[PDB]
């Protein structure tokens, strides 16, 4: 009884007048389809910088979501943006994406940090969880994702527990062309929705929203869809080109 | 004979709709300082969500500068801005700040990737060099200015080091109301000159831009402007006020 969400990350990809063009070559399609019964939420994530731009080309539902924030109200951060001024233009952010995680340092514990801040500014986070391929060809997957849950899940109230969205994404997955199978990502899917349950309780577990990323697609979506615990998808270059419209209609 | 440049670094501070009544407030009165001989150019530098709402109320000359970007040119880096998006609404970018290198580890290896990407793109990089308390207390200024001009403005060509525009901001001045003085700005500043000189020659140092940063007002602008090697001011929280306004009338 979850609803499905397809959230599009577009990266590095698009400045302001190239994110317009996107969105004006696939807005008629995407909102034909998703008017369908049992469709996804649609969350379309553009470059900071081109949030004005497609947010222009949207109000002439899908909804806009940054690929990050910092997590203080306001202040000397420069380069930041803060969660008053995503809200401004977006219903959501994605929150410790692998690639944050790596090039740029982010811990569980700062991710926890803007959590909280989407949440108490009515932001939905899409917190990303992953294992690499080191760890997950020497059998610590399970580990690394406790570890990252109970990290950069922590804190949540009751009613927070319910509006947060966790990502699942193999890191060995992303970019490379080759997803997890279904059974892998289910497998793994559901070991992050125990560990939510063993801290924040069944019913809690019951309602949160697990997306799976890494090459979706729409050729293998409806793969993932068909899993019960796999509530959605993070899609990564495929969101880029008309085939994200393809994948809400598989989704 | 170098232009002066009046920088205003916002911060993470004013959001799409406060960014564009803040310049709403000030332009008609900014303009009007600017246009007098003699006068700095002027940029101003808004959150980077915030530059389209700001690019719409300058174009109903002031520049618009962004306060950090990434320096490939696209591609798998969730949260960054391409310096191709950066060039669709600014002139100017401002790299190396002190709180990115304290803050999210920016390296002088990372700002100089970013300068040259910069340079490459036709924007005007802002970058900032500096000690910290420690660094000053124990006497290593020179040896911490020397290192960062070395690592962050290498690989220049003679044009290049023309337009780059350099920004010292002792880090021990920077938010606590505590300028340096005008004696101790122009001593370092002297010293930026001369490393600059060691590597690309006298020509080339003798048209880079170097400003002073940390708790600039209009109060004390004039202080640092006196000295000819100070060729302007990165501006902090001062460019959050109308008191910007009259740093620029005072410079």
């Given at each position: 009884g979850r609803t499905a969400i397809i959230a599009g990350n577009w990266k590095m990809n698009y400045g302001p007048r190239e994110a317009a063009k996107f969105v004006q070559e696939i807005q008629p399609a995407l909102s034909e389809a998703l008017?369908?019964?049992?469709?996804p939420l649609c969350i379309l994530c553009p470059p900071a910088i081109s949030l004005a731009a497609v947010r222009a080309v949207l109000d002439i539902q899908i909804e806009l979501g940054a690929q990050n924030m910092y997590f203080?109200?306001?202040?000397?951060?420069?380069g930041e943006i803060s969660p008053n001024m995503v809200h401004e233009l977006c219903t959501t952010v994605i929150l410790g994406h692998s690639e944050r995680r790596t090039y740029?340092?982010?811990t569980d514990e700062l991710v926890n940090k803007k959590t909280l801040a989407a949440l108490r500014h009515e932001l939905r986070p899409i917190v990303c969880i992953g294992e690499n391929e080191q760890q997950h060809e020497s059998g610590e997957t399970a580990h690394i994702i406790t570890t990252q849950v109970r990290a950069s899940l922590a804190n949540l109230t009751s009613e927070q527990a319910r509006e947060i969205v966790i990502a699942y994404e193999p890191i060995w997955a992303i970019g490379t062309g080759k997803a997890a199978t279904g059974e892998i990502a289910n497998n793994v899917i559901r070991q992050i929705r125990q560990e939510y349950q063993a801290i924040y309780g069944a019913e809690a577990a019951s309602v949160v929203r697990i997306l799976y990323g890494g090459s979706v697609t729409s050729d293998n979506i409806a793969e993932f869809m068909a899993y019960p615990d796999i509530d959605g998808a993070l899609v990564g270059?495929?969101?880029?080109?008309?085939?994200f419209i393809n994948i809400v209609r598989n989704s």
């Open positions: 008017q369908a019964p049992g469709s203080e109200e306001k202040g000397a951060f420069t740029f340092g982010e270059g495929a969101s880029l080109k008309p085939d």
